[PDB]
């Protein structure tokens, strides 16, 4: 009877449900919250606009929010990241979802718009859950009136947080936000170990290439680049790392990687002469992890070893100059989300040409495009943080507060450490791990409560 | 020159040979020498220093002096001095009071020799400390000296805790820099230094194969992380204990099984609480916490026969060695290696099978049984120390009026720009090449091309 | 052309795109293709082939054809075919009978379609086999065909065992080359292939996080070595079981804890013999043995709820799946992934917590749930296959007098010189540069500058 | 008792304490000691022994004696003796001629003291050798003594090569057991021993950080495999050179870049052939080959300033140290650590930057700068030694009829069943539990339930 959705194939729903039932068993923090808060219905009356990869893991998040009282309207934040069986299962449960794997850019924008509008008019949304900031931007630029009713935004990822902080600095942010990314059980779990799991996964599914013994260049060594570099090194790749941040570069050196630049002496003057052609001519795989623009540029692409794989695991595709490749080189689809890019010219290629690159997911997030992103047991931490953040901001009721109280509360904050610890404890118990309890004397000795928090807010883990 | 006490002054030439090698391994620190030599930013500084008198500390001391400082130096541990390093410093005409194998009485005497010159308080105006013993003695016994001191630069996590307690209680008299929490210290020294030096010390003390054996690491902060890797990389099967669930989550994700010595994780002080099956399979226990009694008497009783026991946290009370001294017979194998015979206190059978091996009498094992962290890692810590000394000395806290002092009294870290400057020199030391952002890229992510590259919230 | 049966011929263009990529990843095999094209050493060869119909096997098949052979092909496992590879081979005019998800009846039919052409035995004169099923069918059901066959080239450990048993019993009718025991096969494919593809298949089937979880690997031969590394490198806590103490020693030294499913290692057939405490903590069990019932009914009953069970040895009887079919309810998650509900046979609760996850119905998991070994590894195995086909075809066993046959009826390996030549091409494929001995150095160690470099005793 | 020469007999108590610990780490060897003590299988054996006089060798010597043998012992390297081990052996009344830091003349004298007792040949009837120097001296200088010798048991790869050359040339006078090629020797000692002890020795000699730096390992046999892992596990970026393409393939698959010191691998003897760009980035070079001049004069000229150079193959001629002695100035840092100044022969500037660091004067670095392999690894090697001595002594070659001698003049290995029995004791030492086959399983794979478990072709 329910028709308020658009997915690839509703008949995938039973398969999706089987996978959701398995995922629930892999997500003890999130399911623990579901069990803890079900009675109290802390999200009763919440109307959440959600924009995040419509995977199985996101399904467990959505059904947790609903189980706690929320209504939601959902879209994916990437054209290739949906798992169609997950979308089907959510739609089959009577939840509005607009998402499929392999959207066009026009379809992507349309799906976000279907969450925002219900029956042609703005939905009475009062909460936002976002990954990367596209939904947040559309609301501020095109639907500013809807933000008058919204209590908060809970933002998943580093890039989205940057965008929020810029808005706050400029006075254009209209509702408070929680930076979910910077929970330790998000940033130092999902961003790092998630990519460790899923980068090599995606490259194998796309190419079935042996990785051992081959040369990789990882651009960036933040949380994603750390995890990515390990994904490849643990397979036996000879990994080199590029960075602009000398502290992150120091970490790469100490971690056993050679730190190099694509450019002579690190200076990117925009000319072919600046490219270290000797270095790039030996690289079999380049992975971008930065959240920055044009870190695998046209001249680097021209210089790469024949038959190198090129992919991006940062949030947005402009890390690699794919526009240059579309303008100048011929694309041969191997299979979905795997293209050979023939450097011999624009139109026409020889089927047996040797001078090509392999691009994964058209430069979009490769882990989600060519595989299934992070595994449930890792996403458990990120998504338990999301639920806690939604509860906190919904309960604070920003949209209803007096102006002076709003002025005090308009901020981008993180969750308290106590809650980060509580999420982590459930994760550890999920592994069968046992956390020791401090004695009262030990807790006094190091100056903490037996119940935590166990570290000062300055601590970096 | 006679204003020193070392084991053997004739070791000085050997020490100098090692200092010359260490300088080549310490580009950040040597770079500071070249950068600041002309300006002499520490001219007039009189620094009381208390930190492990190793070759690495030698290069630190000579850097401070090269920048204009005078110093008076002691070690912060009874077993951590390298006698050739101490000799070389004494031979350069610098007051140093330090040798490997001090008694506790000698340790206290050496600190006192830095504080006093010719029987009266030295006109000290700066403090460099590792662990807080010198800082405590100044506050408790020589409070008048703190009236002239511009600041304290503290090396290690335990010392920082002690400073923060003072600040909370309003008893801290001078500002401090928490040198530990530079990323180029905490996430370099504490982690990778222990990775290098823990397995080193265990091999020197015992020459035991580590591969295939079972280890329990107590703690998974920076030292526990590095320690766990030191052992895992050798092929140990490592289990980790933690009180902090976030650190425990990291251990799980890093590929370790997380266990408690105690049933249900509850340390009720009884033998019944001990997981005897677990402890009876452990070949090596390492404490990394900065806490007290984390390898306790009941754990020691339950350990597998012939297990090795050591501590790499700052102080020896991590292990209940007092219990062992009271109850069990100690057989010295060689210096800093004892068999502890669990058969009783009154002698031992030379062929007894029921013993534990304790390294460095439970004191910092990396420094006690080997040489601590390597020069290229200490480069980062000690470049931060020099910069911290400069920062606080230049700010001249001791010259402000009391109301202005009250506003300026803090425990702070160095600014990120300086942490980055140290890191860059470390990276160039490896032959690493850092990429420069284009103006468009710097705009895109909202940073200067010169840095800093991360918000102060960033955890690396 | 209609002499084939595949899932979907329209997948052929996709398969060809992947073959063109695979050729670039297989320098040893494509080097042989180019080298022997002129000579046509397999002109007149009529090869019955039974081996997983993957993209890699496609490159092998097209190499044999390029060297003059005709072939008729089937897969040696019901789940191992890549349908696009089969399509591409069929589209090239080569008889192939293979698809992913065959029934056992279909599997036997496909082998029979290779053996028969137009309802009568094909005039086969060569056999290429993986695991021995084709070899067995010829000996048992078509013995007259073996009168014309010059040899068998056998890919895998299990098939070689079966050949050696036949030879011992006097029932082997044609000579064979053990391709498995080239170093560029056994110590490449069996080990590093499983390192690549075991974790691959578990991720594709389950998308389970592996880091931090407990695995038990049964066996520590070449496949168990590679499998254990596949899991450990992901951060699993891996325990290893073995019956061979030398292999167990290697596991210990490699950093694994060596355990038995049975108390004191004694499998008496009772539940009381099972180490239920150990098995109750295992999240993943992988069988690697080539043996029977190494993950038995009582082990399955004892495993932790929701454990994954899989087999990467050649045949499914490593795990007692027959017990599971008789007693427990199977819920298909998706193809080649079943939840096995331990609550009973007659239906299951969709929300039951007491289940195991079985991959590929206990068949070779790397090929069943992923794509098996990668091209650049299969390059070594399949270069050896081509060399072995050439050698046995050129020897012409079927034509020799009885006394000469008697001398030649054996199971042999390829010479070390050829193993080295394959390896050299593999190394150059990575961009590796092998040093050439000087004449003095070659004299010093007693080898030719060209090799072979090691005595036949050498184990690598 | 005076029939010995050691550095310092007063080290004996320390040595004994370490022997008591080593016995607890050597369960295979101590198991043989317990098993065979009653039967005294070496009663009447008079063994000339030449092998590194370490604590581990002490346990071997005392096992041979405990089984009835008399021995006369020397070290097979000038730097490998542990003086406390030598002292303890001498203090037990066993003839030993060994100290750390022998001259070449002293080394030859020590071997001669084993051969002669009171100025005339000892009535030796057995030889235990490591590297072949003793074996060579007997054949060249004391051939009459070989008439009464029943056999030689040879520890190491280089010594085995020398024996096989003798056999090929018809100059070998007594049979030998190649102890090296037991799996519990070659694939334990040669590989995992160097994994343990290479990084150990480099740390003790230099205290250099290894993580992040560039290494070149020359060779990828058993020692090169273990060596490469020693460095990679510390975080070095390791490149590997090889002449054997199969070993090079393994290095690639193991995650190393395979390179040559020479452009395109061609060593034409000129400076122009050296890849100066590659060598100018290497911080550490380690030779592992058993070959000559694999780190040659031109390579040494091209290495990065301040690179460490060492050898872990049996003999020092792997590195052209003679070139360095002729041309460059040596500055001793401390024992077994020299800076070699490339500025000229006649003196050096103490602050010169253009030097290399050579460890142990190019002699076996693990034994020279540390203590070699750990007891628990040497357990396997030395259990094999004891078994080999028993076998050859019981065979009584010297006393056999000539036709039987002709058949038995050979170089053989120990049976696989005994290799397995050694391994089982090693595994139990770790607390490992080996599973026992059921009768049906043993039938299925074609072995006895008690083993042996693999055919003699198996490479592990
Ligand atoms: N694919 C996934 O599943 C996933 C998971 C988490 C985060 N993300 C995304 O990944 C990106 C990175 O996130 P993060 O948490 O690691 O951020 P981060 O800020 O921790 O790290 C990014 C790094 O890129 C480096 N960098 C920037 N420009 C560079 C350049 N020109 N060359 C080399 N290095 C350069 C920075 O110095 C920094 O250390 C973001 O876009 C984030 O949203 C994706
Ligand atoms: N030996 C060295 O060279 C060296 C180097 C740096 C620091 N340190 C010292 O090592 C210690 C630890 O330093 P850090 O930087 O790792 O501090 P840290 O705060 O990062 O980590 C200590 C960890 O111990 C854990 N812990 C506390 N009590 C515990 C208990 N009862 N059981 C289990 N875990 C427990 C805490 O949760 C914490 O994660 C300090 O004493 C520091 O001064 C020594
Ligand atoms: N899936 C693949 O791609 C692939 C690749 C190569 C080989 N194989 C197959 O894998 C299997 C193993 O091949 P291999 O080359 O490793 O053989 P192998 O002989 O080297 O190793 C098998 C090991 O199993 C051990 N074992 C036997 N019974 C045992 C038991 N009850 N418990 C514990 N350990 C036991 C043996 O001691 C031996 O070490 C064979 O069936 C082979 O054909 C599969
Ligand atoms: N230090 C120790 O404790 C220790 C332990 C065991 C053995 N050894 C000694 O180590 C040496 C090696 O023993 P192994 O068992 O590894 O022998 P191996 O035959 O297994 O390996 C030696 C390797 O060196 C390679 N090689 C030869 N010449 C080369 C060259 N010019 N460039 C590059 N690679 C070259 C060979 O191809 C071979 O793979 C021998 O001298 C042996 O006696 C020392
Ligand atoms: N080689 C060394 N020289 C001086 N200090 C050291 C050395 N190794 C470790 N340390 C210091 O020991 C402290 C613990 O007391 C750490 O904070 C660390 O910086
Ligand atoms: K997933
Ligand atoms: K040091
Ligand atoms: K494949
Ligand atoms: K030793
Ligand atoms: Zn997003
Ligand atoms: Zn200290
Ligand atoms: Zn097969
Ligand atoms: Zn020797």
Author numbering:
A (entry chain A): 9 to 469
B (entry chain B), C (entry chain C), D (entry chain D): 10 to 469
From the paper:
SAHases are usually active as homotetramers. The protomer has a three-domain fold, with two prominent domains, the substrate- and cofactor-binding domains, separated by a deep crevice. A small C-terminal dimerization domain locks two subunits into a homodimer by quaternary complementation of the cofactor binding site, where a tightly but non-covalently bound nicotinamide adenine dinucleotide (NAD+) is found in its oxidized form.
Two complexes of Zn2+-containing PaSAHase were crystallized in the presence of K+ ions and adenosine (Ado/K+/Zn2+), or an inhibitor, 2′-deoxyadenosine (2′-dAdo/K+Zn2+). In the Zn2+-containing complexes, the divalent cation site is not fully occupied. Our crystal structures help to elucidate this puzzling behavior by showing that there is a tetrahedral zinc binding site, formed by three highly conserved amino acid residues involving S (Cys85), N (His323), and two O (Asp139) ligand atoms, located in the active site, where - together with the H323-F324 molecular gate - the divalent cation shuts access to the active site of the enzyme. The zinc binding sites are not fully occupied and, therefore, the side chain of H323 from the molecular gate is modeled in two states, differing in ~180° flip of the imidazole ring. In both conformations the molecular gate remains shut. The rotation of the H323 side chain in the Zn2+ complex is necessary for the formation of the coordination bond. The second rotamer interacts via the H323 Nδ1 atom with the O5′ atom of adenosine. The dual conformation of H323 is correlated with a similar disorder of the adenosine O5′ atom.
